[PDB]
């Protein structure tokens, strides 16, 4: 008995933006990204490629891995939640740089070209599309909280925290609200990098989870919750 | 040549040229109807696998069946071209009469010949119902006019068995087929728009010629001053 | 228990990285890459589009790092494009960086063996069917196929059996690589899924279906 | 009429929703009346275009392609009618000959011993020399 | 029941039927506000209409007005060295030393 919509032609769901706060959504903050540049040409510092120089900088080589950050964005962006226009990625560089990742961007699959973008992005402060129509990777002013939705839930991934079901968690949360996950791309470290902003910390599994695995596990349950499919 | 092709050099012009005859020819003489009867058989085998729908086969069948019962005043939507070909009531329709139409008889050309052409046309109808129309979503609509015609055949000729078996067969197909509202504009949801990033592979933190002039001209201007100084 | 191809009885998850482009090229032998070696592949005559062992690394990385692997309920096979079959031991800990990933595959393909002092990665004789469990269901990922809930799919399947998924690591190609072995084709999402994403989504369903958690 | 959304089956729909859907499928009847002469009373709007679905199996390839448009999104706002009005059997045949792209002729691997039936393998059963 | 009166293509240019005729034609390259006003006045299309509401003959008249502007008396107004410098300056530098 209900009247059909006039236009059944598919329309891509709106590209969500930080200026927009009302829409219910899923923010993932890849906290502590090891993204640093340095002239040799500026090259993204890596744990394996650049060991001697980072020693000259005095920073430990263990935590100099942008590969982990690269992997999390690949699965997050290629997740079918991103295809539904319901997710953005924020990157909190260990240095203290907050980066907004447009859902439309395509980071290159190869890590070498990914590193080219990060030295590129960090220096101009932005990235523009090939057709010059939208800014895909833009650095944004700290604190991260201002950019988040006005009504939103904040959680962190903690191994020591109680194990929960992501599907049950999102179902019991409200609708107008949104959920923030502060995922540690940090290889090994204490889980307090988002303690100041976040209200509670939850565990996703009894066993340790990689940042790429944990975020992918979180989002897949979210689609089961909202039926994104 | 391969008849079971969507497009072919010789089949498609042949089928288009051939479908014209099943519709354009008057079929107002026993020679003409028998020619159409064989024409039906070839198109039936041209789609022995492809199983495609030829509307002219429906039109040709409706008129020829009605042509041999001439009108009963109940089918005013069918265009007849001859009303003097009505079969007589005295026809036995129980003797074993050959349904094969020799092409050499076509040149020669009575009741037995008229009845035989009816069977070969009639036998082709069962095969088309059994194979082609059964699969089509509009089977009930396609078979509805034909079903009414055969009801006249059974009522007029009780002994005649061929329409009754096919009427029983037609009844069986309609019972099993579930005539549900068609659903086609269900589309896979489209993803968010998609753009690649623009950048330089090796990032620099006539154009080159101009800069070289600017850099060293300043060097020139500086050093002349201290020398003159 | 560390699961092995010898044992067929146990219900297990076999994820098949079919048509994997991990090829060794000597000017010394090095794993071919779509970007590193473009002119060399042109001389070899193969398209550089389908010259990406990168896609295979993340799939192994997400499969091996999934909780299901930690529970001892998953195995991975890699059917190389040329026709080389590789069994991936669940206990293996493949390198996180791609450069070190490439250095292993040249060792694996030439030595046919990577041993630690059980063999972690082993080249094995085709066909895949004999290695698979005796009672086993076979499916692939097909974008055109109907979309099905993985959790509902695994639940309705029996217990003694096993399910195989032939995941296509290609950047692009027709989904007929495993048509000979499989009995049906299933889609996982309306939107296209990367090989890493799709199996990561798939393995998540298996964890929920069996309560691996 | 082209599509009734109430009859779509969704993977997420609960088992009770599945059962209700089957009952709706069973009790449907086509309400379009062909003999009513007043077009405002034929109850056509409650019906559907199964006939158009058949035409996408039409023997002619291009005709089948045109019918397939109803299965495609309605991006096009309108179709120039004058480009479709004056077509005849002769025009179609002439258009077939004047084809922009030329294809290779194909052959049938299947072998028929006799092209016509008698009065092993017969191409045209029921027709004899 | 029978009463017979969104986009249109003019000059191989898509103009939205929603916009006014004069400012819908402004989008055309080489067509300004004043020129579109003059064309509408010449075509006897009263300027208030939307592009969608224009009938066929009116669009034909507009096209004929534009394509033959002189025919309708439309006013006429409407219708290496850097390397050489661097080499010279290098010579100056060398001579200064």
């Amino acid at each position: 008995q209900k009247a059909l919509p006039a236009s059944l032609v598919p329309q891509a769901p709106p590209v969500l933006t930080s200026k927009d706060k009302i829409t219910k959504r899923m923010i993932v903050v890849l906290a502590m990204a090891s993204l640093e540049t340095h002239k040799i040409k500026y090259v993204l510092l890596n744990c394996d490629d650049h060991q001697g120089l980072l020693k000259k900088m005095g920073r430990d080589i263990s935590e100099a891995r942008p590969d982990i950050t690269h992997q999390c964005l690949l699965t997050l962006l290629d997740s079918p939640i991103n295809k539904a226009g319901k997710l953005q990625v924020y990157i909190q560089t260990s240095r203290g740089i907050l980066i907004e990742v447009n859902p439309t961007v395509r980071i290159p699959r190869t890590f070498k070209r990914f590193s080219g973008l990060m030295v590129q992005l960090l220096h101009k402060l932005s990235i523009r599309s090939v057709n010059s129509e939208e800014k895909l990777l833009k650095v944004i002013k700290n604190p991260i909280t201002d950019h988040l939705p006005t009504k939103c839930r904040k959680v962190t991934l903690s191994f020591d925290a109680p194990v929960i079901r992501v599907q049950d968690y999102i179902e019991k949360l409200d609708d107008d609200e949104s959920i923030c996950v502060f995922v540690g791309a940090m290889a090994r470290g204490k889980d307090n990098f988002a303690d100041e902003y976040v209200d509670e910390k939850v565990g996703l599994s009894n066993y340790p989870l990689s940042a790429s695995v944990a975020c992918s596990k979180f989002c897949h349950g979210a689609e089961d919750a909202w039926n994104i499919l | 040549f391969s008849t079971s092709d969507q497009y072919h050099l010789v089949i498609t012009p042949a089928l288009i040229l051939m479908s014209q005859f099943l519709e354009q020819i008057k079929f107002n003489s026993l020679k003409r109807i028998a020619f159409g009867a064989v024409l039906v058989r070839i198109v039936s085998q041209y789609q022995r696998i492809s199983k495609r729908y030829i509307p002219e086969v429906v039109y040709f069948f409706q008129k020829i069946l009605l042509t041999f019962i001439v009108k009963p005043l109940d089918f005013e939507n069918i265009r007849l071209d001859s009303y003097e070909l009505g079969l007589p009531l005295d026809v036995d329709f129980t003797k074993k009469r050959s349904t094969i139409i020799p092409l050499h008889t076509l040149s020669t050309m009575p009741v037995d010949q008229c009845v035989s052409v009816l069977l070969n046309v009639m036998e082709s109808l069962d095969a088309t119902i059994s194979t082609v129309w059964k699969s089509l979503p509009a089977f009930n609509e396609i078979i509805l006019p034909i079903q009414q015609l055969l009801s006249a055949y059974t009522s007029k000729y009780s002994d005649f068995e061929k329409p009754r078996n096919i009427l029983n067969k037609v009844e069986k197909l309609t019972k099993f087929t579930e005539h549900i509202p068609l659903a086609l504009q269900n589309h896979k949801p489209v993803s968010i728009p998609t753009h690649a990033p623009k950048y330089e592979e090796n990032f620099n933190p006539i154009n080159k010629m101009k800069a070289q002039l600017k850099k060293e001209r300043k060097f020139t201007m500086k050093e002349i001053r201290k020398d003159a100084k | 228990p560390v699961l092995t191809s010898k044992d067929k009885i146990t219900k297990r998850m076999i994820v098949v990285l079919a048509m994997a482009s991990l090829e060794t090229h000597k000017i010394k032998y090095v794993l071919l890459n779509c970007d590193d070696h473009q002119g060399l592949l042109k001389k070899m005559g193969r398209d550089i589009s389908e010259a990406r062992p990168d896609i295979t690394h993340q799939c192994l990385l997400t499969l091996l790092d999934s909780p299901i692997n930690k529970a001892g309920k998953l195995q991975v096979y890699i059917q190389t494009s040329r026709g080389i079959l590789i069994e991936v031991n669940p206990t293996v800990r493949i390198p996180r960086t791609f450069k070190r990933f490439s250095g292993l595959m040249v060792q694996l393909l030439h030595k046919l063996s990577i041993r630690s002092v059980e063999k972690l990665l082993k080249v094995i004789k085709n066909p895949i069917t004999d290695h698979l469990p005796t009672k086993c269901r076979k499916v692939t990922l097909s974008f055109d196929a109907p979309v099905i809930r993985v959790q509902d799919y695994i639940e309705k399947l029996d217990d003694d059996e096993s399910i195989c998924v032939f995941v296509g690591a290609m950047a692009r190609g027709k989904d007929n690589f495993a048509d000979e072995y499989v009995d049906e084709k299933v889609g996982l999402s309306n939107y296209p899924l990367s090989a890493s994403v799709a199996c990561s989504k798939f393995c998540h369903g298996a964890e929920d279906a069996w309560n691996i958690l | 009429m082209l599509h009734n959304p109430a009859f779509i089956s969704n993977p997420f729909q609960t088992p009770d929703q599945v059962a209700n859907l089957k009952t709706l499928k069973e009790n449907y009847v086509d309400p379009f009346d062909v003999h009513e002469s007043d077009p405002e009373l034929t109850h056509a709007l409650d019906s559907s275009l199964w006939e158009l679905a058949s035409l996408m199996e039409h023997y002619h390839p291009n005709v089948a392609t045109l019918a397939k448009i109803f299965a495609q999104p309605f991006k096009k706002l309108s179709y120039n009618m004058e480009d479709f009005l004056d077509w005849n059997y002769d025009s179609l045949l002439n258009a077939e000959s004047s084809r922009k792209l030329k294809t290779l002729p194909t052959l049938e691997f299947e072998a028929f011993t006799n092209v016509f039936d008698n009065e092993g393998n017969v191409y045209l059963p029921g027709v004899a020399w | 029941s029978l009463v017979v009166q969104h986009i249109l293509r003019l000059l191989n240019t898509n103009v939205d039927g929603n916009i006014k005729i004069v400012y819908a034609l402004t989008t055309i390259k080489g067509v300004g506000r004043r020129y579109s006003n003059l064309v509408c006045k010449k075509a006897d299309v009263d300027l208030h209409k939307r592009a969608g509401e224009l009938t066929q003959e009116e669009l034909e008249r507009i096209v004929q007005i534009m394509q033959n502007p002189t025919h309708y008396k439309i006013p006429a107004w409407f219708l290496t060295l850097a390397n050489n410098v661097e080499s010279k300056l290098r010579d100056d530098l060398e001579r200064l030393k």
């Binding site: 290629d78 395509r106 290159p108 699959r109 190869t110 070209r113 | 998609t194 690649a196 990033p197 592979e201 | 779509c34 970007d35 473009q38 990406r52 896609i55 290609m170 950047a171 692009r172 296209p192 899924l193 990367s194 090989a195 | 309108s78 120039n80 009618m81 004058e82 009005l85 004056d86 | 986009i7 249109l8 293509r9 003019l10 191989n12 898509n14 066929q56 669009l59 034909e60 096209v63």
Partner: peptide, 27 residues
């Protein structure tokens, strides 16, 4: 009549995405 409306509809006629693991174009 066809020629008259053939002129009409010329002005009605209007002349004239990565997926999966597809990478951005090289250069």
């Amino acid at each position: 009549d066809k020629k008259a409306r053939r002129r009409t509809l010329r002005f009605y006629t209007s002349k004239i995405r990565f997926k999966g693991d597809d990478d951005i174009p090289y250069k």
